Write an enzyme that holds these catalytic residues in place. Sequence first.
Site, PDB file in Angstrom:
ATOM      1  N   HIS A 171       0.834  -1.195   0.000  1.00 47.13           N
ATOM      2  CA  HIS A 171       0.000   0.000   0.000  1.00 47.13           C
ATOM      3  C   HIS A 171       0.872   1.250   0.000  1.00 47.13           C
ATOM      4  O   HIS A 171       0.618   2.200  -0.741  1.00 47.13           O
ATOM      5  CB  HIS A 171      -0.917  -0.010   1.227  1.00 47.13           C
ATOM      6  CG  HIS A 171      -1.516   1.322   1.554  1.00 47.13           C
ATOM      7  ND1 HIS A 171      -2.651   1.800   0.938  1.00 47.13           N
ATOM      8  CD2 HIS A 171      -1.147   2.263   2.453  1.00 47.13           C
ATOM      9  CE1 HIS A 171      -2.959   2.980   1.444  1.00 47.13           C
ATOM     10  NE2 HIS A 171      -2.063   3.285   2.365  1.00 47.13           N
ATOM     11  N   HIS A 207       1.211   5.118  -2.116  1.00 48.38           N
ATOM     12  CA  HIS A 207       1.605   6.432  -1.622  1.00 48.38           C
ATOM     13  C   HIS A 207       2.864   6.984  -2.296  1.00 48.38           C
ATOM     14  O   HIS A 207       2.836   8.057  -2.901  1.00 48.38           O
ATOM     15  CB  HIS A 207       1.832   6.373  -0.110  1.00 48.38           C
ATOM     16  CG  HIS A 207       0.571   6.431   0.697  1.00 48.38           C
ATOM     17  ND1 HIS A 207      -0.006   7.617   1.095  1.00 48.38           N
ATOM     18  CD2 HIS A 207      -0.219   5.444   1.184  1.00 48.38           C
ATOM     19  CE1 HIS A 207      -1.098   7.361   1.793  1.00 48.38           C
ATOM     20  NE2 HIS A 207      -1.250   6.050   1.861  1.00 48.38           N
ATOM     21  N   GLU A 258      -5.673   9.159   0.169  1.00 51.00           N
ATOM     22  CA  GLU A 258      -6.068   7.762   0.243  1.00 51.00           C
ATOM     23  C   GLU A 258      -7.014   7.309  -0.865  1.00 51.00           C
ATOM     24  O   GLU A 258      -6.707   6.384  -1.613  1.00 51.00           O
ATOM     25  CB  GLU A 258      -6.692   7.477   1.608  1.00 51.00           C
ATOM     26  CG  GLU A 258      -5.690   7.509   2.743  1.00 51.00           C
ATOM     27  CD  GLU A 258      -4.783   6.294   2.742  1.00 51.00           C
ATOM     28  OE1 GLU A 258      -4.007   6.132   3.710  1.00 51.00           O
ATOM     29  OE2 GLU A 258      -4.848   5.500   1.777  1.00 51.00           O
ATOM     30  N   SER A 303      -3.348   0.764  -4.466  1.00 52.63           N
ATOM     31  CA  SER A 303      -2.850  -0.464  -3.856  1.00 52.63           C
ATOM     32  C   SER A 303      -3.934  -1.533  -3.769  1.00 52.63           C
ATOM     33  O   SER A 303      -3.643  -2.703  -3.521  1.00 52.63           O
ATOM     34  CB  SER A 303      -2.304  -0.173  -2.457  1.00 52.63           C
ATOM     35  OG  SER A 303      -3.339   0.204  -1.563  1.00 52.63           O
TER      36      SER A 303
END
Lengths: 322, 322, 329, 329
Positions: free
Chosen positions: C162, C167, C207, C226
């Site tokens: 993730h 990110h 996010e 992700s």
Amino acid sequence: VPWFPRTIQELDRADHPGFKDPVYRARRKQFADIAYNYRHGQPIPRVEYMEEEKKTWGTVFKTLKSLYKTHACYEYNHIFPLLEKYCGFHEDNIPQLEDVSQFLQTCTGFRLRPVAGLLSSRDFLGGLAFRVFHCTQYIRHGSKPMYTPEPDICHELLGHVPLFSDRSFAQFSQEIGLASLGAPDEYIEKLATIYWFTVEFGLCKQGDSIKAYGAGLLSSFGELQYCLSEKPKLLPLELEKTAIQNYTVTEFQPLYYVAESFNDAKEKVRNFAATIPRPFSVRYDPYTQRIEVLDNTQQLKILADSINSEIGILCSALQKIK
Amino acid sequence: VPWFPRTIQELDRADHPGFKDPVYRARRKQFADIAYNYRHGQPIPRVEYMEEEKKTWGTVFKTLKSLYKTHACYEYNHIFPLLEKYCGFHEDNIPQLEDVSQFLQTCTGFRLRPVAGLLSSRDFLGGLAFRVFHCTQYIRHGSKPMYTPEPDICHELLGHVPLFSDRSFAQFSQEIGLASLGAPDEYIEKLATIYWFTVEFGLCKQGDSIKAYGAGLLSSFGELQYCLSEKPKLLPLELEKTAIQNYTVTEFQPLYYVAESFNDAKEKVRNFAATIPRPFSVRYDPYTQRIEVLDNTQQLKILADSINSEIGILCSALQKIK
Amino acid sequence: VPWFPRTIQELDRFANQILDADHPGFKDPVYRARRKQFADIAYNYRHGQPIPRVEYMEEEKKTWGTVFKTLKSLYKTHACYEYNHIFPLLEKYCGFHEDNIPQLEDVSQFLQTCTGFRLRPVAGLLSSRDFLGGLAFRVFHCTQYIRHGSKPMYTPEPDICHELLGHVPLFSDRSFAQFSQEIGLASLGAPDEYIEKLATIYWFTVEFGLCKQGDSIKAYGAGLLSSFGELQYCLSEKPKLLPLELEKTAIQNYTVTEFQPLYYVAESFNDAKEKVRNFAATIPRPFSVRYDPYTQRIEVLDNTQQLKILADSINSEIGILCSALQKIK
Amino acid sequence: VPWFPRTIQELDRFANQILDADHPGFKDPVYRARRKQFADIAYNYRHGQPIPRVEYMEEEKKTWGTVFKTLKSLYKTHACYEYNHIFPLLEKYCGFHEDNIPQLEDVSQFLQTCTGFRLRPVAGLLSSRDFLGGLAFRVFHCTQYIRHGSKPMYTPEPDICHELLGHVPLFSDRSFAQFSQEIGLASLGAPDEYIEKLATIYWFTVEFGLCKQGDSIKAYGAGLLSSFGELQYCLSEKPKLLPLELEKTAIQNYTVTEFQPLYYVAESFNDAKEKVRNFAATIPRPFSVRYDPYTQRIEVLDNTQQLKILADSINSEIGILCSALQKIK
Ligand SMILES: [Fe+3]
Ligand SMILES: [Fe+3]
Ligand SMILES: [Fe+3]
Ligand SMILES: [Fe+3]
């Protein structure tokens, strides 16, 4: 703290050649009375000038018209043909203030106001804060049409007016006005002195050469050619050491501070203005034609808003200039 | 690109109750003629209103005066006692436009202008760019003193005027005016629609509660109490989805966009203004009372200067507030 | 007023050392002690020193490649440009390949040369105030561990997949970094209500946010990139999209375990950064913060002097804008 | 347009390697080869690596203490505040004592935590364009060598005394650093005439400048602080002081071997920095530069886009200045 006008309407507050002339005398008292009776808002009364006067006007309008394209500054040579073609600027007719005022207003917003004779520097400068010029409706005596012991309709019209038609010059003048508002005597006198070596007897920068933009210079034939020669010791317009400078009233000044530009002089002025120790700051509101005293926290909320929107314009504009 | 005024003087360009009344008819044609003859600069002509009219005025001045401290917004309740104490706002006398205009001018700079009857949104809004409001000098017919099919001296005076006395509201209005200048029809109509859910039928934020600031609301007794109830479905002032919104003309609107503030609505307006696709940017000059088209590189040199000096004030002021 | 880090090295307090059955792998004694191995690395990590390297296992490397393959296909499709641009550089530089798990020291060292963002191994999770606080220094608290191989298509919390395949690629973009940092500077000393509000924004942006790429919409959210199942879902015509409006976005309530019908569409990262700058001014703080990248130190200002500071700043910029105009004729 | 460094590591071109009898010690074969030893260190020094340490000799350590003693007395007297403030910290930290010559790696490492200024060993001397160019990255080109012991009260050029007991203390001050950097950013790609003008300014400021400390005047010039004879001379009533006016200061012609009757009095370093900011706009450059401390990289902008950049910057700052006012009632 000295008292200063908050509103535009608040402005409502023998060696001499012709001293032996009973007519010209009572004539000049006629003009003054016009001033004393003049209240803001109403049109400046028109006057039927006499030939003995119209002759003196043309004697100066001819003597100086020749040296303008030569010694006078650009902004002057540019607006003149417009003054001549519009406000009746001709050696055969004396221009009416209501016309000039009405004119100047559309150029920069500067309105004329007939002053009795003379007034304090604090009062004079105070008018500038509202883009208001205190002008003399009268004229020198025909005895010596090449000399005036004080401002006459020639000095004001063929000296000051053309400069007040220039966008950059107006804001500049206004700065001094806003500066002088409530300023202590010492600084008031200092500003006056600056006003001299600038508005009255100042010289500007036009590329490499130097031109005359001073009102006292342009209206005076003898000094118009003198200030342009290599006899006086020129210096840079430095308001710091310019306010200290002492000058003579009846004769020529060896010192003539050379300003880069009015837009430029404006900044050293603002500086000299920032030098002025006042317990606050004032801002002029052209919509309410009031003078805003910035001392409260809400007073700044609104000035901030004024700017915020104006830049928003400056940005959008810029964004469209790729 | 649509034509728009550059100067302030350039603005010189049977179901009805009383349709069967030959007097009131010719009376309303009397008022209109005043408009057609009115040119900027001269004072708005005064009129001797009749009792049959003065009665209708007081019938509305009484019916609404009660619901103002209740439903009307603060800025309204604040200025009223000043309007009453100054511009002759009393149920026994109809206020004279020259007075109201002269008044509003000292508050924000907004001047009134007598309009014949009605005009395009583009024309109406265009006046706002100069802080000029096109007002109706006439009045509804006494038959139904609680209903008007269009703007009358009551709607304009007991609805619009009080808002135009507020500093933040004026700039806000003006923004729309500057926006509409040369804007394409689609957006012109969009702005009008916004003008509605704001100036005409808008609701503001006063802490937690909601008040009525819409001109159409304040002048209308039946909707003044309706918009304040829990029947209509309120929404946030979002100019994006507010311009699309379709509304009825003859009846009440279930939708009333709640603006945080006029200073605040102003920003979504500027935004909606920034949304307006114009091949340039315009700026109003209160001194020359001209409209400046920003397209040239020198045009920006001067706006920059205007700001530069204004912040210099904002700074000096701030520097003195420790 | 809540305590916040003044220096970049003060983040050592987040991973001090002192101070769930449904989870896949909870019954696994190895993976368990393995994830405690990773955490310990965090607790022992102090700023300034290089992030320790780890020898990942095949059972792990398999899960990495299972996600690195499943998502690599949908990136040029659903992922945003800034992502598709930096990837080949991440692959060609930080060892981004399905056969090898990228080492944090490399990624961190890398990201630093792009925007200045350095990575920091976090034990497991931390408060929004703490997380956001790191952003103020362009420091990202990353997880060195990885989900359990049982379900390589689901993670109950952030794992190295993730963080790296979600990110990191965004933190390599110039405009995104400043944007993130803004939130960090905002959260500094901010009251809980606003801290939570920012977190919520951080969600519908960093996010699970969607950006604008001309006419079409792309996914730039880290949680989206992700996650295989939501990567294709957020791009379809099932969710009700809305404009990135931080005012009504902070109020918005969302679910943690499932898909969000709401995905705020931001014009650009450069655009949002501003929506955060001002939002900070709209935040009740008896002071104002200012970061100094030269000394890696935060400065705390008093609203009044902060006021004066703005004045001078404006007054300055304009005069130059004046001079700039003069020479450009 | 002259070539200028875009990256901080690009300064490695200044000390590439490739590319005077009256001097005291010219006849000394040792000191000679010693000073060539120092220079070689420079030629071999590449950014990123720690500055090599050197074991100074007593004949040198004596000269150091002879200057460290002669000047230490006149600092609290003639030196400026920012100097007298940082000294005890330099003494207590970077080994500033008459018995030991301070190591550059220490001073550099130190200065970095204060303002971010790092030191860089320069062979001997370099162009004003090159010197100033380093300032744009908050990098100071320092000399590792020292004058000859023959005349410990005179140096024909910068030595570790002039740099350490003259320049360094000023580069530890927050306001001074930004100021210096401004000149660096200014000189980037600037035409010779202006490059020389800046150098001249750099002189009557950094080298031989006098600041304002209330009513009195103090010495902050690096050339003044490292020179005993002029330290007491510039403070007397013999020289004709003038105001720091970059306009007429750049025209001013000065002597190299002797004392200057002119010493421009600056109000503050914070004050002058602005005099440089704008002066840069008044500099003929078909572009504008912008430093990024996060990536240690210079960005070259096109006057037009630079214009637009200013606009947005202003437009932003003001709105916040608007919001700031709102909450402060
Ligand atoms: Fe005069
Ligand atoms: Fe209306
Ligand atoms: Fe995450
Ligand atoms: Fe030096």
